[PDB]
Write a protein that binds this ligand. Sequence first.
Ligand SMILES: CCNC(=O)c1cc2c(-c3cc(OCCN4CCCC4)c(Cl)cc3Cl)nc(N)nc2s1
Length: 213
Amino acid sequence: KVETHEFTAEISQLMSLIINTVYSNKEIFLRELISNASDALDKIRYQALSDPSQLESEPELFIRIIPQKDQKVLEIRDSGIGMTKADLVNNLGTIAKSGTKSFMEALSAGADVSMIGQFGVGFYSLFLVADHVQVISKHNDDEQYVWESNAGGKFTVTLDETNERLGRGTMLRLFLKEDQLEYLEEKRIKEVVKKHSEFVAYPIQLVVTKEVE
Ligand SMILES: CCNC(=O)c1cc2c(-c3cc(OCCN4CCCC4)c(Cl)cc3Cl)nc(N)nc2s1
């Protein structure tokens, strides 16, 4: 059951700008997504202070990076508060019009792409390294859904009947560009995490697949 929706024009504009920029420090995308994951974890932790039962859907609080070399996909999963179906339509491709507009003005004046997070739209930095993204999300008291975009003007939201269950949280599935496959490598991922994400309150877990020999 696939619903199609249109991006707020300014958000479409930003995605095209980012997916085409030739910027040289693309590794900062990972800091931005980890930062979004930390913030989502802050929110479920806030609710859990009043109501500890909110954690029961996924009791471990974590950020997990899962390279899928077979698929040329990098996944970033958290057990944060997550997003309902309405959130996915709204937060993504509607809200943040204001931040996208200001960021684009700053870019024209010379701003570093790396200050995207200061306008609240660092999520879209993923298009530095990916040409296609799926956002899978599960909020307490709603079903699991998949939001999907290819940096054009349309996105879809679907009940998720094909991915592992998240329990609670969000998983971004980045379909990496052919020149950015370095971010599937354990050594590269560790470098970037250690450089740019030292002060994160939650464990950052790296899933690595090794042959037994
Ligand atoms: C509905 C309550 N939960 C949320 O809004 C969440 C938003 C996210 C996000 C997120 C945040 C995002 O925005 C960051 C916050 N800014 C948005 C507007 C100003 C602040 C964007 Cl544009 C996209 C996404 Cl997928 N990422 C992740 N990993 N988890 C959550 S949970």
